[PDB]
Amino acid sequence: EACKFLHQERMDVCETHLHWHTVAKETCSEKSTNLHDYGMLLPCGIDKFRGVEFVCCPL
Numbered sequence: 844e845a846c847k848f849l850h851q852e853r854m855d856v857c858e859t860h861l862h863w864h865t866v867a868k869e870t871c872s873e874k875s876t877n878l879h880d881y882g883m884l885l886p887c888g889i890d891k892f893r894g895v896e897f898v899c900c901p902l
């Protein structure tokens with residue numbers, strides 16, 4: 844079925860991998876979907892990034 848491709852780039856923040864994975868996970872849940880693949884964007888340190896892209900699919 845149709846899944847949704849989403850990404851966030853926030854130049855005003857620099858956050859851990861876990862933070863961004865939580866953002867992706869919770870965004871999909873908010874939309875009544877499940878997180879499939881995801882990837883970190885705009886690194887700002889070792890294992891810190893300024894964004895994330897991810898895919899949400901129907902439960």
Ligand SMILES: [Cu+2]
Binds near residue numbers: 850852
């Ligand atoms: Cu973009």
Ligand SMILES: [Cu+2]
Binds near residue numbers: 878
């Ligand atoms: Cu999971």
Ligand SMILES: [Cu+2]
Binds near residue numbers: 878879880
């Ligand atoms: Cu997953």
